[PDB]
Amino acid sequence: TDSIVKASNWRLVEVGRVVLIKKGQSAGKLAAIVEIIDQKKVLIDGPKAGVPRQAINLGQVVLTPLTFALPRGARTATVSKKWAAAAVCEKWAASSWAKKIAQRERRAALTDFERFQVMVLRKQKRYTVKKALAKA
Amino acid sequence: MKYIQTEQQIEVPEGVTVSIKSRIVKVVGPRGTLTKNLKHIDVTFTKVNNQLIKVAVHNGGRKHVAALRTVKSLVDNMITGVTKGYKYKMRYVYAHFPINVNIVEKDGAKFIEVRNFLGDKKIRNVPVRDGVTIEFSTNVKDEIVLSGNSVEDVSQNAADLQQICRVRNKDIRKFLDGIYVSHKGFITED
Amino acid sequence: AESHRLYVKGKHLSYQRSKRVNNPNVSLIKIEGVATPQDAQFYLGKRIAYVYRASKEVRGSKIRVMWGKVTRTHGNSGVVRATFRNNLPAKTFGASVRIFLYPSNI
Amino acid sequence: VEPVVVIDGKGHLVGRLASVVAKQLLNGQKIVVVRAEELNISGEFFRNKLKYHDFLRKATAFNKTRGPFHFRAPSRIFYKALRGMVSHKTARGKAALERLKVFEGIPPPYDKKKRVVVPQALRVLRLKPGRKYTTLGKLSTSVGWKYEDVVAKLEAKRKVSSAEYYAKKRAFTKKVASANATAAESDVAKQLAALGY
Amino acid sequence: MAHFKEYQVIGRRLPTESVPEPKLFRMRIFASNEVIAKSRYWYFLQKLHKVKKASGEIVSINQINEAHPTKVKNFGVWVRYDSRSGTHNMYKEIRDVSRVAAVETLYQDMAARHRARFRSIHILKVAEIEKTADVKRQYVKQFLTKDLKFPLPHRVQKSTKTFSYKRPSTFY
RNA sequence: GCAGUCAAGCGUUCAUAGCGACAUUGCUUUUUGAUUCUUCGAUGUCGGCUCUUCCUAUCAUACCGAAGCAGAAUUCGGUAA
RNA sequence: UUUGCUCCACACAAUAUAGAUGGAUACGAAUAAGGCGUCCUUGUGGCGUCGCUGAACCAUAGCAGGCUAGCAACGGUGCACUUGGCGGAAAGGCCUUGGGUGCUUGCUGGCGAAUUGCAAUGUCAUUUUGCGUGGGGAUAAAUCAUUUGUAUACGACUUAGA
Ligand SMILES: [Mg+2]
Ligand SMILES: [Mg+2]
Ligand SMILES: [Mg+2]
Ligand SMILES: [Mg+2]
Ligand SMILES: [Mg+2]
Ligand SMILES: [Mg+2]
Ligand SMILES: [Mg+2]
Ligand SMILES: [Mg+2]
Ligand SMILES: [Mg+2]
Ligand SMILES: [Mg+2]
Ligand SMILES: [Mg+2]
Incomplete structure (x- = not known):
């Protein structure tokens, strides 16, 4: 006797929404939405990661699931204060998204001897995995 | 003008389960069940407190948020049709030839036949949509009552029974003859 | 190893052309994995071979080679320009060429 | 990057998919397009039906068996789209169209092969939400294609067998992922995680 | 016109013997560069006063940056x-x-x-x-x-490849 | 030749059921004027007969909307070759 | 019946290549929604989780990958043979059973490689064919000419004849 409505989980464009710049000079750095200009334009500010306070489109921008409590139009010192108080970078680096960015950077930063060691170790782990697959 | 966020307010009474998946609404009440497929609209349904469901359009134009109140009225019609039901009463209007309307059975299909419409030898058959039940009112002369859970089914079956009795090649301002909807209402209403 | 490849696959797309006039002296090569002219700047100067086969055996081999090199980049999407010693035969618009890693600077 | 590329034509727009596929065939890539009867065209069904009737009304006046052959099947509607994006009167164009196979449904061998999508052509990525679109199977049946029901019955059977396969595959993937997550917190797994794997 | 630039442009109407020190009319001009800025200054001063470029001079042109950008x-x-x-x-x-x-x-x-x-x-x-x-x-x-917030429904992600193997999802 | 816009007015009253002056805006190449661009080292020159196809600006037939459509008969119009 | 024809295996030639050079790596559906895992009252359920690209996953060390000695394990994989089931949309493939037979880089060893001389695709694929060897299999028609007239300008059609 209960109504059941699916309630699609969207990352909102809100003040304090932590975003990830994907295009431009920052390009992989986090910032915080500080004000909303229009539907397509926001004012972000990324003071710990080095992003300047700027008006950016929401098309150079990926909203992350992270949100910290930030007042609207907060200047850069306030944004850095609330950011470091709410520990945005520590909460970001624990996510499976930032671990995937770090993993693909590490994989691209592998050398040839490290790729050889990856092959040797993958065969070694494969032996135990395929051995236990038959038993279980 | 691209409105930021428009909201409408579907109120859910007691005994009524409005379960909404993607855009397939299922309303179950004391009278039965109704299912609508609203996958052509692009709205977002959110349940608030089991007696209220908001429906929303984010970044919608005028023609898009025009459909939001249509959706709210459609789910409200489902709720009203499974709580109070729907009941459309039609009257037979004739000048000389009495319109003989019966309910007939044709290989398990439940037609309404209309004989002697303007002295026609043609028998006008209107199938009965499922969910719609037909009765003929005692103590009200020449009244047929179409009632059911669905306002769309009931009102379209009433419209079909009206449109089968249209007058051809005559001045329809004088030949006013047919079956017309005289009342739209609910089954258990007071 | 099941793979012995020491080159990067490419496709001979077409000759250099305008809408209606082609230049057979310059060929366009789509190198696999290159999607940017800045990526294509790695392969500039690298030797291209178009390796094909015949029936007549000329020097103890039924396999013949057309040699050339990447000269510059073409466009915005990693297509490069190649020049060959003898031009590519234009029945190979869509054939595979091999872009070797020599002369290597990396 | 594959020897042939099997493209699931469901949810794609016909001209965008055909402009992708034409350039790939001319670049030398062999392409199969399966499920051509779920291809979308932008614009409503009546608009596209009127466009096909405009195509249908034009044939050679003195002998209709010479004119524009109005092919009715969705695969041949897509192939008509893709010709005219290929320079088909030349040997290079004929050789490029010999690299293409377009099918209704997913027939044999391609039923047991991986089907890819082309996101530059996908309707959910290209059309504005709320824009009307048609489906190639409905359009073909309205203009005279005779096997919409046969393809639907065979596709339902194909979907049943592929769902049985995927239930077995999920059981095996559960076993493999359980064996791999057991292998984590080992020395080899930690050394691979240090190298990014 | 990638972004516009606002210029103050100050011009004078060249000093004569009867009137030395003329009146220094000033405008704020949005233009791509100083060439267009001086051109628009003379276009509007020919609408307001009896002066043109031959019988006037530009005394100053300064870009006015935004005070709080x-x-x-x-x-x-x-x-x-x-x-x-x-x-x-x-x-x-x-x-x-x-x-x-x-x-x-x-x-x-x-x-x-x-x-x-x-x-x-x-x-x-x-x-x-x-x-x-x-x-x-x-x-x-x-x-x-x-407390304005709004979501961005139907995210379309730009692919760098011509073939995808996943049938992509437009969640955000 | 055929449409359209405005509406003083005709239509017992009533501009627009049906017409519609004074103006005004267009369509078509099925008439005729205008050109002399092709043909003067032959494009056989009207009409008819025969036979095929196409257009719609629909006379009839099918389905309808409007009337100063009671019925009958008409009149205006739509889809429609 | 100048021992014809066809199939399988290997050997050698000729023939070419719309263009191999680790692997085409299989749910369906929705996108204003889903995938996976788990739990229960098995649902349009609860909880967790993931995406933000395949930049993945699998494979991948060895004279183009030789010979040989062990340790650990009873796994992985190739080859033929074999048991059973499924697949008709173009099935001609998918999944299994048992033994044999290699290989194993899961771990530790021994020997070899050179002189292709500073690079020359430095030849490793899969199509058709022929010829030859040794193992099977089968033992017809059609056309002309004669004939019919259900056909016909001629062909063609349609009939008949040991
Ligand atoms: Mg009448
Ligand atoms: Mg070209
Ligand atoms: Mg698939
Ligand atoms: Mg037909
Ligand atoms: Mg002459
Ligand atoms: Mg002549
Ligand atoms: Mg003539
Ligand atoms: Mg008409
Ligand atoms: Mg008419
Ligand atoms: Mg017609
Ligand atoms: Mg090996």
Whole structure:
């Protein structure tokens, strides 16, 4: 006797929404939405990661699931204060998204001897995995 | 003008389960069940407190948020049709030839036949949509009552029974003859 | 190893052309994995071979080679320009060429 | 990057998919397009039906068996789209169209092969939400294609067998992922995680 | 016109013997560069006063940067443009962080909605609306609501490859 | 030749059921004027007969909308070759 | 019946190549929604989780990958043979059973490589064919000419004849 409505989980464009710049000079750095200009334009500010306070489109921008409590139009010192108080970078680096960015950077930063060691170790782990697959 | 966020307010009474998946609404009440497929609209349904469901359009134009109140009225019609039901009463209007309307059975299909419409030898058959039940009112002369859970089914079956009795090649301002909807209402209403 | 490849696959797309006039002296090569002219700047100067086969055996081999090199980049999407010693035969618009890693600077 | 590329034509727009596929065939890539009867065209069904009737009304006046052959099947509607994006009167164009196979449904061998999508052509990525679109199977049946029901019955059977396969595959993937997550917190797994794997 | 640049342009109407020290008329000009800025200065001073380039001089041209380029501001823009069949005045409102970005939005807005080219348009005034509820247009009053948040439905992700193997999802 | 816009007025009253002055804006190449661009080292020159196809600006037939459509008969119009 | 024809295996030639050079790596559906895992009252359920690209996953060390000695394990994989089931949309493939027979880089060893001389695709694929060897299999028609007239300008059609 209960109504059941699916309630699609969207990352909102809100003040304090932590975003990830994907295009431009920052390009992989986090910032915080500080004000909303229009539907397509926001004012972000990324003071710990080095992003300047700027008006950016929401098309150079990926909203992350992270949100910290930030007042609207907060200047850069306030944004850095609330950011470091709410520990945005520590909460970001624990996510499976930032671990995937770090993993693909590490994989691209592998050398040839490290790729050889990856092959040797993958065969070694494969032996135990395929051995236990038959038993279980 | 691209409105930021428009909201409408579907109120859910007691005994009524409005379960909404993607855009397939299922309303179950004391009278039965109704299912609508609203996958052509692009709205977002959110349940608030089991007696209220908001429906929303984010970044919608005028023609898009025009459909939001249509959706709210459609789910409200489902709720009203499974709580109070729907009941459309039609009257037979004739000048000389009495319109003989019966309910007939044709290989398990439940037609309404209309004989002697303007002295026609043609028998006008209107199938009965499922969910719609037909009765003929005692103590009200020449009244047929179409009632059911669905306002769309009931009102379209009433419209079909009206449109089968249209007058051809005559001045329809004088030949006013047919079956017309005289009342739209609910089954258990007071 | 099941793979012995020491080159990067490419496709001979077409000759250099305008809408209606082609230049057979310059060929366009789509190198696999290159999607940017800045990526294509790695392969500039690298030797291209178009390796094909015949029936007549000329020097103890039924396999013949057309040699050339990447000269510059073409466009915005990693297509490069190649020049060959003898031009590519234009029945190979869509054939595979091999872009070797020599002369290597990396 | 594959020897042939099997493209699931469901949810794609016909001209965008055909402009992708034409350039790939001319670049030398062999392409199969399966499920051509779920291809979308932008614009409503009546608009596209009127466009096909405009195509249908034009044939050679003195002998209709010479004119524009109005092919009715969705695969041949897509192939008509893709010709005219290929320079088909030349040997290079004929050789490029010999690299293409377009099918209704997913027939044999391609039923047991991986089907890819082309996101530059996908309707959910290209059309504005709320824009009307048609489906190639409905359009073909309205203009005279005779096997919409046969393809639907065979596709339902194909979907049943592929769902049985995927239930077995999920059981095996559960076993493999359980064996791999057991292998984590080992020395080899930690050394691979240090190298990014 | 990638972004516009606002210039003060001060010009004089060349000093004669009867009148030395002339009057120094000054304007604020949105232009791509100083060439267009001096040209627009003479275009508007030929509309206001009896002077042209031959009988005047430019004494100064300075770019006016935005005083707070990272504060989101509501601008009222009074504009006069030439339609196909007349001349009209408009008042539009643009929310942006700087006057030059607001004027770029205005020029795109006018060319889009009213088909008005750069030559047709005179920027009569750009002034920041200092307080809300003097803001007059609904399309900018939307964003001045308290605790405004909105989602971005139907995310379309740009793929770098011509083939995908996943049947992508438009969640966000 | 055929349409359209405005509407003083005709239509017992009533501009627009049906017409519609004074103006005004167009369509078509099925008439005729205008050109002399192709043909003067032959494009056989009207009409008819025969036979095929096409257009719709629909006379009839099918289905309808409007009337100063009671019925009958008409009149205006739509889809429609 | 100048021992014809066809199939399988290997050997040698000729023939070419719309263009191999680790692997085409299989749910369906929705996108204003889903995938996976788990739990229960098995649902349009609860909880967790993931995406933000395949930049993945699998494979991948060895004279183009030789010979040989062990340790650990009873796994992985190739080859033929074999048991059973499924697949007709173009099935001609998918999944299994048992033994044999290699290989194993899961771990530790021994020997070899050179001189293709500073690079020359430095030849490793899969199509058709022929010829030859040794193992099977089968033992017809059609056309002309004669004839019919259900056909016909001629062909063609349609009939008949040991
Ligand atoms: Mg009458
Ligand atoms: Mg070309
Ligand atoms: Mg698939
Ligand atoms: Mg037919
Ligand atoms: Mg002559
Ligand atoms: Mg002659
Ligand atoms: Mg002649
Ligand atoms: Mg007409
Ligand atoms: Mg008519
Ligand atoms: Mg016609
Ligand atoms: Mg090996």
